[PDB]
Amino acid sequence: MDEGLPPEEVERIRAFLQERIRGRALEVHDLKTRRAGPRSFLEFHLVVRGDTPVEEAHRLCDELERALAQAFPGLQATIHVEPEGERKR
């Protein structure tokens, strides 16, 4: 898909995030994308340890938003942080 970016592009974004969260988070999931003009949008869930302070999890959020914006010109990300009970499977 509908308003999603091309599946190929979503998977490039996924692979990029997966490399960037190594040792810093448990997983990224529920990637949802779309394009509007000069802009692309990504929202996803970043799964971390439940006892991770918001301030710490958020530092990683800022790092990721900047990394994504640079690696995918036009793309801006909104990140929803979750505890380990939200992990896939």
Lay out the site mask for a copy of itself across 31-50 (x = CB under 8 A, - = otherwise).
-----x------x----xxx
Among 23, 55, 73, 88, binds a copy of itself (CB under 8 A): 55
- Taking Cα atoms as reference points, which of 48, 46, 82 lies closest to residue 65? 46
Residue 18 binding result from a copy of itself, Zn ion, none, given CB thresholds of 5 to 8 Å by partner type: none
3-state secondary structure of 15: helix
Distance of alpha carbon 77 from alpha carbon 87, whole angstroms = 20
47: how many CB neighbours lie within 10 A of its CB? Answer: 21
- CB–CB of 46/63 below 8 Å? no
| Residues lying near a copy of itself in the complex (CB under 8 A) | 3, 36, 43, 48-55, 57-58, 61, 78-83, 85-86
Residues contributing to the annotated binding site for Zn(2+)? 29-30, 43, 45, 55, 58, 62, 80, 82
